[PDB]
Amino acid sequence: QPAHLCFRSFVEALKVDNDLVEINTPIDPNLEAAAITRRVCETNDKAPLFNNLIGMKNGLFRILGAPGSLRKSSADRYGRLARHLALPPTASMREILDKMLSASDMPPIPPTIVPTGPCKENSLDDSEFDLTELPVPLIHKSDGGKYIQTYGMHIVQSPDGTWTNWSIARAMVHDKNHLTGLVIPPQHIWQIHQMWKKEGRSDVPWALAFGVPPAAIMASSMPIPDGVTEAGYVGAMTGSSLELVKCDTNDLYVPATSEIVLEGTLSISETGPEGPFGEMHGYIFPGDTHLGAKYKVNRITYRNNAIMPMSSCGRLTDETHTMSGSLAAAEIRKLCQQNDLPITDAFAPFESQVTWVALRVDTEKLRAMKTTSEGFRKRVGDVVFNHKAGYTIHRLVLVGDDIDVYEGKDVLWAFSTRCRPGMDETLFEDVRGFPLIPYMGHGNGPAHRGGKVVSDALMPTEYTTGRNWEAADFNQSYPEDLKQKVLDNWTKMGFSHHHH
Amino acid sequence: QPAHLCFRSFVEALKVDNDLVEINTPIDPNLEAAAITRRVCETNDKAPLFNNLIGMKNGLFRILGAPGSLRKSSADRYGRLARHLALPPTASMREILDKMLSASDMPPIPPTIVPTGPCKENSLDDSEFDLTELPVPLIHKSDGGKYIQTYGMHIVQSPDGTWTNWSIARAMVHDKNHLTGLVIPPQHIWQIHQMWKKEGRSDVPWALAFGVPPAAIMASSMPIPDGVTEAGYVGAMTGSSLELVKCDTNDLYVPATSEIVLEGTLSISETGPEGPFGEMHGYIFPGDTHLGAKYKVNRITYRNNAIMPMSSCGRLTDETHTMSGSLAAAEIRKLCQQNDLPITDAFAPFESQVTWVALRVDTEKLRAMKTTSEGFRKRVGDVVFNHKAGYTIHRLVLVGDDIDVYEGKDVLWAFSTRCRPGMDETLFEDVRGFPLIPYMGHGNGPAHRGGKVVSDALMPTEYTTGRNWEAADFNQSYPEDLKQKVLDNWTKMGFSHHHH
Numbered sequence A, B: 001q002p003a004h005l006c007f008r009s010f011v012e013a014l015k016v017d018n019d020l021v022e023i024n025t026p027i028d029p030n031l032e033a034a035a036i037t038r039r040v041c042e043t044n045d046k047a048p049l050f051n052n053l054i055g056m057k058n059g060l061f062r063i064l065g066a067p068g069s070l071r072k073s074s075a076d077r078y079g080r081l082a083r084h085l086a087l088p089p090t091a092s093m094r095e096i097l098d099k100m101l102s103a104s105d106m107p108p109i110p111p112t113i114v115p116t117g118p119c120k121e122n123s124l125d126d127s128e129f130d131l132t133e134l135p136v137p138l139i140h141k142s143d144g145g146k147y148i149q150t151y152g153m154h155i156v157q158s159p160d161g162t163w164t165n166w167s168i169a170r171a172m173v174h175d176k177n178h179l180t181g182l183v184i185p186p187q188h189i190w191q192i193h194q195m196w197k198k199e200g201r202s203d204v205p206w207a208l209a210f211g212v213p214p215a216a217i218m219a220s221s222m223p224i225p226d227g228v229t230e231a232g233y234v235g236a237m238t239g240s241s242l243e244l245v246k247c248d249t250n251d252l253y254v255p256a257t258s259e260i261v262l263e264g265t266l267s268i269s270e271t272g273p274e275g276p277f278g279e280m281h282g283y284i285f286p287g288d289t290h291l292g293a294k295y296k297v298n299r300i301t302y303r304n305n306a307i308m309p310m311s312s313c314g315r316l317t318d319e320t321h322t323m324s325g326s327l328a329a330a331e332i333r334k335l336c337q338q339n340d341l342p343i344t345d346a347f348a349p350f351e352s353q354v355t356w357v358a359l360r361v362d363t364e365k366l367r368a369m370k371t372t373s374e375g376f377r378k379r380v381g382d383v384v385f386n387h388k389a390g391y392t393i394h395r396l397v398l399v400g401d402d403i404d405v406y407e408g409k410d411v412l413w414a415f416s417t418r419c420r421p422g423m424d425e426t427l428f429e430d431v432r433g434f435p436l437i438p439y440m441g442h443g444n445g446p447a448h449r450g451g452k453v454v455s456d457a458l459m460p461t462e463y464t465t466g467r468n469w470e471a472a473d474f475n476q477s478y479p480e481d482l483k484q485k486v487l488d489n490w491t492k493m494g495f496s497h498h499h500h
């Protein structure tokens, strides 16, 4: 049970890393837990483990906040993510996204069924649990319900049994034995729900597993292709078949060390009030009156001393940014490569509220295409904005070889100086839009359509003969021998650790 | 001779502030001085004073780099600018821009003529100086000449004597007694040059004063209106009439404590090779072959132990950003107010390479206008992009009351989440463009025209009934009593100085 394969092991890894704060005094799930977690995410502090949660009863539950948020140091900024994947805590974004993409051209390693696991240590039936009596957090003061589900994985399977999807989608407590949640196109939970609704025979067999293997929650957050079972993708990525146990009340399979498992159904007919919720872009519209999907809970199984992970999402920086934004970027990089586009790297700048993706271009391959900005912009746009991987992304910024797209400042520099507004852009109004972005859902135009752009920050010679500028910076506007002299004499002259 | 009125006094103030490094060992004006200064600006280190400059002869000259660049601490980030203006070193951007705008509705305090000053301590005639024999810096390795002029003020007067303009415009050594420089529309040095050329009688009487009163170099960098004599604007802003001495060889007047004064003429007929230069947006195009204005130097007068100030401009953060960007923003704020637009604040985000201005909107006044995004966008655009104050700015971002426009992260948040690409924007293709921006001068379209946009990051209800969201952040999504409890218990629980 290594950290990347066992949530309990992961929590011990964060403690050992000095990247955990154990709070053992009573904390209120009504806003206090989430407020502390929000402050953590805004300051890149240590992850909070709430061992003493007002209203925890019969082992349900402790909370771990900020499971995938950032560390303060530059040197191990992404160490929490690295700990999800068995990577060194010093891993770069590139290394993390490469790991997440590694299984894309490997044969799946399907999961291994085991008779039991720690998730079966405790159970509560139909008659023994009430979801309104559990210490479910109120995460933001105007939230329209207590969001039990911010970092567990929904498990649904196609009617024909050939595709089992694992994904994060939010869900809140509706009553003693129901949740309501987001189930929206083009998301795979929605695609599978549609399959069941067209068969029209029954409600969707469903499970929701919290505190799953960290590598599985990463894949849960990533738009891997339609029809690809996350379990086998994680198996290939890690090199280890995941151990799953059967649900007690249906024939779905859950990670054996899951902290907490809900078993039940996702309705093909019923809805209920859902949200509003304080969301990845940084907003809540109090009183929004949306309907969402309705889940019925038949059973709860859980580990002794069960830990619920929780994302207190909103303004920078949390799991919606570090995981949902970055993993969409990774999938867009691959999608571009598979469509023969000379894209080396992609990242969703945090500064853009992960609504942009910067696409680094191999300009030597670009030159060999003998194309133009308008033609290339359109082709990139068509590929990414007509695919599910481009769903959440409203601006693509194309940048040449000199720009590190993992560095927001360099993306903003290139964008601001190399893309002429209007002329160097193409607008896409007949593509699916992401309604959660306030200028979509709460804006001047159609909530679900358009509002997308490809901004070309490639300079004209980058299409023809090659970069025709040097940066007016220390790196490029001074010869190596001089730069090294300045650096060697810096403190001697009177000017002012990598880890620290 | 207070710091804001005397450059020599200002240099002592920086020393006293522990905001100066005196380098007393030999430094090469060929790139070394500028490389050290560039590294300073990229790191917000102390200002370098080069007391020992290879090729300094007969008192010409020492160099002070980064005179208006940033300090490392948040608490006195803008202290170098504050020192230009007699403000406390802790002054905010708002306070600095308010000071710079204060003289806009005050009667000018015209300058006082004095018989002599420290700038007359030494003189070199026609026969005694050679500009190629002075320690003029090579500021970037691909610069097309040694840029003597990066932080002195050009002094030119209208033919009718009614308007004396002070301004920064770059200039490089052309030969023993000529400079070439940028003189471009709509800049006042260009407007006055045009007046002389249409009279057609003589070349423009000219002076270039280096190490002028800090408050005068600030006004030199700011687009105060057409026909307004900077000297009297600085007089009103400071409450003190500036003391000026007459040039020896013409009837122009220079600050009495100027470190170094060039006297001569700006040609109405001749040009010469100018640039390329490592520029405010962060770029140099080596080999650009531009012609520029040609200045003839007839005389040099200077202080004993004369100090030349130098801007090693380029990538963030230097005087082109802190002064030229911010002071244009200030003038745009005022221009908007004078056109009855409900704008409270303006700032040019550094992240935008000071190509954007964020305009904070008083949304209560906006609501009372009973307008729409398209109408308001157009009116704001028309005002700012058809005036000289909007010259350098290619994107206006309109933001409501909740956004601090002095905080780049909050501007980028609002822009990224509240402005729908295309639909919430208006493009302006028939306005003057700033060719120095690489996507203009070196881009796909006309160098001098268009490429401007007003991006509306006001939300729809901000025009009608009022903000209809709360931020999903620590400040807004938790009640005051809880936020204060979290902050009071922060270190007790195990989480981690304003000055530091």
Ligand SMILES: Cc1cc2c3c(c1C)C(C)(C)C[C@@H](O)N3c1c(nc(O)[nH]c1=O)N2C[C@H](O)[C@H](O)[C@H](O)COP(=O)(O)O
Residues within 6 Å of the ligand: A149, A150, A151, A165, A166, A167, A168, A169, A170, A171, A182, A184, A186, A187, A188, A189, A220, A221, A222, A223, A224, A311, A313, A319, A320, A323, A324
């Ligand atoms: C990391 C993470 C991702 C998501 C979410 C959150 C986190 C932390 C919440 C805090 C719970 C906020 C919730 O709004 N949320 C969420 C969501 N996708 C939705 O359809 N609906 C959601 O409510 N994603 C994103 C999806 O996880 C990815 O888009 C993924 O690609 C889906 O899997 P699939 O459909 O590709 O299989």
Ligand SMILES: Cc1cc2c3c(c1C)C(C)(C)C[C@@H](O)N3c1c(nc(O)[nH]c1=O)N2C[C@H](O)[C@H](O)[C@H](O)COP(=O)(O)O
Residues within 6 Å of the ligand: B149, B150, B151, B165, B166, B167, B168, B169, B170, B171, B182, B184, B186, B187, B188, B189, B220, B221, B222, B223, B224, B311, B313, B319, B320, B323, B324
């Ligand atoms: C602060 C500062 C401003 C400027 C410049 C620099 C600095 C440091 C250089 C480093 C020397 C780079 C030089 O490119 N440069 C510069 C320039 N304006 C130009 O027309 N030409 C220039 O070459 N401005 C801006 C002008 O100073 C302002 O636009 C001002 O408003 C002009 O005065 P006016 O015409 O309004 O009287």
Ligand SMILES: O=C(O)c1cc2ccccc2s1
Residues within 6 Å of the ligand: A170, A182, A277, A278, A279, A280, A281, A313, A320, A324, A392, A436
């Ligand atoms: O509540 C939220 O923050 C989110 C909802 C969704 C829907 C789809 C993709 C990402 C997200 S993030």
Ligand SMILES: O=C(O)c1cc2ccccc2s1
Residues within 6 Å of the ligand: B170, B182, B277, B278, B279, B280, B281, B313, B320, B324, B392, B436
């Ligand atoms: O050389 C440069 O960086 C600059 C040239 C100009 C011209 C006008 C306004 C600002 C600048 S800044």
Ligand SMILES: [K+]
Residues within 6 Å of the ligand: A166, A167, A168, A219, A220, A221, A222, A223, A224, A230
């Ligand atoms: K997934």
Ligand SMILES: [K+]
Residues within 6 Å of the ligand: A373, A418, A419, A420, A424, A456, A457, A458, A459, A460, B439
């Ligand atoms: K471009």
Ligand SMILES: [K+]
Residues within 6 Å of the ligand: B166, B167, B168, B219, B220, B221, B222, B223, B224, B230
């Ligand atoms: K000026």
Ligand SMILES: [K+]
Residues within 6 Å of the ligand: A439, B373, B418, B419, B420, B424, B456, B457, B458, B459, B460
């Ligand atoms: K808008």
Ligand SMILES: [Mn+2]
Residues within 6 Å of the ligand: A165, A166, A167, A188, A223, A224, A225, A228, A230
């Ligand atoms: Mn999937």
Ligand SMILES: [Mn+2]
Residues within 6 Å of the ligand: B165, B166, B167, B188, B223, B224, B225, B228, B230
């Ligand atoms: Mn002027």
